[PDB]
Design a binder for this molecule. Structure first.
Ligand SMILES: O=C(O)/C(S)=C/c1ccc(F)cc1
Ligand SMILES: [Zn+2]
Ligand SMILES: [Zn+2]
Length: 217
């Protein structure tokens, strides 16, 4: 498991496979996203808590992989996901989201992502296939998951709790009666999962989805 850290230790990238890395930043509260190394540029799943960390993350991966960050997929409109949106927009990085996530971003005072993702959207960056899926309300009204069909890797985002999470966390924006159905929708769509990246904590497998179901009881 190859891990690479910034000079301060607040940003780390860990390799899942040749072209897929998890990025983790400390805001201490760690948060995860993905880095996809594609033939057409780097694509991130999620930014980071604020613009300072987002700039550092972009600069680390551009230097390491020797290509530009071209696109980011924003999985919901909380700061751990979208806090670096100002940095993305001013650098000409495309910030993909559902329309609901964009609406919520604007309501909460953040610059707006594109609002281009539908309930199911299939993107392709070079040879890298990316599917985004809105499974329903859960951790937030707008949360989406991201699927890499060439690897059967699911980015659960904050809809999915890690093994170390012993409760649901802050549920102020959550829908705890719909969250279980939303997880079941993920389990029904993706029946063979190799790795599940939660929004916070260690990478796991389908067991993290079952763990989240148990925390909802
Ligand atoms: O638990 C999490 O994954 C998150 S991202 C919680 C959260 C953050 C900001 C809020 F306003 C509400 C909840
Ligand atoms: Zn959140
Ligand atoms: Zn979160």
């Amino acid at each position: 498991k190859t891990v690479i850290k910034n000079e301060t230790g607040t940003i780390s990238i860990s390799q899942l496979n040749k072209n897929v890395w998890v990025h983790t930043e400390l805001g201490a509260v760690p948060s995860n996203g993905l880095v996809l190394n594609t033939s057409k540029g780097l694509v991130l799943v999620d930014s980071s808590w604020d613009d300072k960390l987002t700039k550092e993350l972009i600069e680390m991966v551009e230097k390491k992989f020797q290509k530009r960050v071209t696109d980011v997929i924003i999985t919901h409109a909380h700061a751990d996901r979208i806090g670096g949106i100002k940095t993305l927009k001013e650098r000409g990085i495309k910030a993909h989201s559902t329309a609901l996530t964009a609406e919520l971003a604007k309501k909460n005072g953040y610059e707006e992502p594109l609002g281009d993702l539908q309930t199911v959207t299939n993107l392709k960056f070079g040879n890298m296939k990316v599917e985004t899926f809105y499974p329903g309300k859960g951790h937030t009204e707008d949360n989406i998951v991201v699927w890499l069909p060439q690897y059967n890797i699911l980015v659960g985002g904050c809809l999915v709790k890690s093994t170390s999470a012993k409760d649901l966390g802050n549920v102020a924006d959550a829908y705890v009666n719909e969250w279980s159905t939303s997880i079941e929708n993920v389990l029904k769509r993706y029946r063979n999962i190799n790795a599940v990246v939660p929004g916070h904590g260690e990478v796991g497998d389908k067991g993290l989805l079952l763990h989240t179901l148990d925390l909802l009881k």
